[PDB]
Amino acid sequence: RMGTPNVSKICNFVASCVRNRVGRFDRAQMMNGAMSEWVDVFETSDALTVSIRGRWMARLARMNINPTEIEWALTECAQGYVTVTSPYAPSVNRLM
Amino acid sequence: QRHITEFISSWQNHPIVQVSADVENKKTAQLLHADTPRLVTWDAGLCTSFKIVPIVPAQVPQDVLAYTFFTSSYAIQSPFPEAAVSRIVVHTRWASNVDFDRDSSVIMAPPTENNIHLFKQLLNTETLSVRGANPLMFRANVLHMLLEFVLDNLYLNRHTGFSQDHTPFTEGANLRSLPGPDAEKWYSIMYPTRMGTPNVSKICNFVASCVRNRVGRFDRAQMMNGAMSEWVDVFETSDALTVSIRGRWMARLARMNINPTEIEWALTECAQGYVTVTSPYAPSVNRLMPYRISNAERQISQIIRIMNIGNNATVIQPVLQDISVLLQRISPLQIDPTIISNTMSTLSPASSILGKLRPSNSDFSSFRVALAGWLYNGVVTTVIDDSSYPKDGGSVTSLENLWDFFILALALPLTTDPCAPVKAFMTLANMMVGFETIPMDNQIYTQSRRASAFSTPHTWPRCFMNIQLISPIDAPILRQWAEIIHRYWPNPSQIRYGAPNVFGSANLFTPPEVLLLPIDHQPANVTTPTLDFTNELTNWRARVCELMKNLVDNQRYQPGWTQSLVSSMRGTLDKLKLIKSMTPMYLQQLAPVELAVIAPMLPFPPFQVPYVRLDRDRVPTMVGVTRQSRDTITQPALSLSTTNTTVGVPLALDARAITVALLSGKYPPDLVTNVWYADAIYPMYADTEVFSNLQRDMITCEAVQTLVTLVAQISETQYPVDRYLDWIPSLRASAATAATFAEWVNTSMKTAFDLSDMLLEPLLSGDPRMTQLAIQYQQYNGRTFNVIPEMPGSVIADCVQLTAEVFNHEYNLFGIARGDIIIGRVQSTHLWSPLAPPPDLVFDRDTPGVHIFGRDCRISFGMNGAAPMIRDETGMMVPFEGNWIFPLALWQMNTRYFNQQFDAWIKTGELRIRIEMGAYPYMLHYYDPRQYANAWNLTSAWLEEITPTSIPSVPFMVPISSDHDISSAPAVQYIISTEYNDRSLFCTNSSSPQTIAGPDKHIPVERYNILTNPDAPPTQIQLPEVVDLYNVVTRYAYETPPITAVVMGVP
Amino acid sequence: FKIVPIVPAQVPQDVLAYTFFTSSYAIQSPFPEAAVSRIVVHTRWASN
């Protein structure tokens, strides 16, 4: 995106760099006010920290549970002494 | 004529007419709700998009100034104004007259004026400067421009009457009369040959040379009214392209044309014989009723409808509400829960239930809503609040809980939920816990587990699945209930619907002519009695009452009762079981008849999937839809469809209200069903909008096919598509870029059809690169059904290809300049144009020593007496002079820097640089040759307008045309084009008799070939090279009857 | 990790031709432009 205005190795290197590998690579969304659960994009960054965050996400996903499951469990724990309730709708992506 | 729907009843002198709301007389009449474009139009004005503009008249010797008769003189008027130079100008339908406007007209400014707005009509609209357009967006803009021209030309020329002429040349000849004034000016344009040319001028010489026979009406339809025939052929100035496009549009209308007798039969079928339309009609010679359609178009449209719906509950609630209002006034049946209360004649269990009922509320929406949901079986789910069920699973001793159970049992068969029987069974088990024992196959699910948790078949218990597996001894009341449910479980029904010959049906997951129902229905009989155990609901109520009595008989479930309520409870239950409600009777006969009548009435076809009452394995789990072809693999993204996990939208309704209504139904005592229905239906049928919905759907289908073809045309795809204007500049647009351009096309189409409703919004929603639409659904056992429709071709695409080839032949006429230009100041007394200057003066591309410069080429600058020579791309440093070749893209990258380096060279430098342009829009300025001309300031301004993002249309300064020798003064111009693009000029200096040398332009014989050449046949064509400005044309008059029905009885 | 500039390039000089003077353009750069520059680890240096 920077203007070359130089024959610098950087300027030659930018011309060499692939034009198409730019912008969001992919996303889990399209609708307005419908956030992508995940999105892929080519950008300056370091692979190692991204990999670390991905493994962190994997462990969190391993512990994640669904809200309907939670409502049933809480109701059972209450034993009818108290009642907890959840409405019926598709997962909007809340980590549990 | 204001009425668009005309209905006359046979049993009443009360005709009912449906009209557009725009009319001033909606008195006691239905109106047309759907937003629909008027595709058919009649033209009261010339269908001309191009008008020549004459810069200065030229005439020489002239025989006569006015025709002489008695003391009066007929004036001589030239349809073509005289000019030293005359060029046509673009204003689509500039001479047309119509009540309806496409609002797609294109006006191109005259050559002295800038037409940049049309070139920038698409992506270049956002420019502060009037001039200037982005090059890589040019191809998209041109395609859209052609599209707008076609949409703007969607009209029919109304046939009009003719008149005998009294002008001497065609005295007694028949001239079609244009409306009111200018008709003689219009006559001169249609029949320039009629105009005499006593004066001598190139126009006059041409008129004198013209053939007398090629004028007036070529032919007329033998049938005619007064001076006007059904169709006619006449000789006049015209554009073949528009006529050809209209012919294709007319051909589509001809295929769509439908016949009235078929309509009468279809109307009778829709009425189901309740009402019948009459056609003892005098035939219309031009009667036109375009109602031919294919169910495949309907299927594509419904897939679009589902994507467009994007689960909008807000859209669904109103349709259901309007339908419920219709059912409320479409049903003569009266509901009287207070009558039930009086029959009861009422610590009281009856008092408890009465307080629970709270009958004061007068709203009955839920029952009608339930019927509507049954109609949309596939997309609708009926659900019940657990709170409707007894609190805490109810109490064996609770009388109020007993009331809840009875009401729940009554509405349980009603619920569309497939696992609802399982839930009711679980509910009974929950109340039975500690009295009867139910085994559970799964530890996770308990006997007291809330039934709503068991919302799916896989959670159906194996003990629940086999009654024999459960011990009858363990839960004998429960065992009996299971057997009774199997013995009396409700039966759903399927009823024939739709008319294939016209509307047909697009049903895929369901049979097209069959309508699915969750309730078995039987033939209506007016004499039928109130009591009917044969009715499934009545039998169910009776069985449930007896089962409850058996359960409460020992009072084991209700210990602690000092007094036996068994006798009282049995009496109340017996009265309830024997209640003479006609609501089940009404549902058995009246409800089916009403639903059958409304099915054609439904504006939106219901979505249903096959009903499997006991087929748990064959119960479908979900429905999948695809925008891509199966072979392609693409990212799945977040969508609206996710919001409804259930394919049927879940709906919860008030069970108490529905149960009370079911127990409280009575018809009017003297009511005649046929009479009541015919009376209500006749205005309602006069209110039909199905035709409008069908027309909108057909337009959407045509648009979709055209869109996919255009996407292949303007994008790189595997499918081969002809693009002859790839030379027109364009970058590789991202799918989103193409989609945004497509969205602009869609907004244009809606405005063109004046559409107030959203069009193809799901199509514009996203996933523009979708290879194929496909849909499938699967069963709990895992069996699946997949439906994929086949694309029907679009006339628009073929017309587009033809126009594209015409543009490629006529792009110079089109006003866009192909090729590049060379920068060189030149002052001379010769008239050579930038389009046609001396070639030697321009350095040709294949020339030695021309300089092209490398992007990183070493650059040297001199300051404070320093002198720099730029190292060349070849690597040899040279002075800033000579003939150079510069790529435009490099220039855009460094426009300011290049201008600064050559600014001295640009103003006074003899250095000549060629920037490769390939194609571009151009701007024309006329100038006076006898006064000094300097474009250097003008060139600087144009260069400053040139920008890295995009460049302005080239500004051209040209001299005023002259037919006579005139004095001249020096003129300085640095812009030199490499090719002649002056084909656009219609004529030059009509006055001059002959030219020894240099440019001279006359009226084109080929464009006036029929008039110019007698040998040429009238229908002979020179397309695409020559387009005749004046030609013989066909105008037809047709008459269209809109929806009209005469309602009567069946023979 | 963020690159840190160690040694910059040498400019300006009278002899140097300036149709070219790159420093005259002064465009912002993604990475440091210098005679010597080295990458450095700065965890969450741009993180918010």
Residue numbers in the entry:
A (entry chain B): 410 to 505
B (entry chain C): 217 to 562, 571 to 1275
C (entry chain B): 266 to 313
Task: Give the published text.
The particles harbour 10-separate genome segments and comprise two principle protein layers, the innermost composed of 120 copies of protein λ1 clamped together by 150 copies of σ2 (viral polymerases, λ3, are attached inside adjacent to the icosahedral fivefold axes). The outer layer consists of 600 copies each of μ1 and σ3. The array of μ1 and σ3 is interrupted at the fivefold axes by pentameric λ2 turrets which enzymatically cap the mRNA transcripts produced by the polymerase on egress from the particle. Here we demonstrate that vitrification of infected cells followed by cryo-focussed ion beam (cryo-FIB) milling and cryo-electron tomography (cryo-ET) allows high resolution reconstruction of assembly intermediates of a mammalian reovirus, allowing atomic models to be constructed which throw light on some of these fundamental questions.
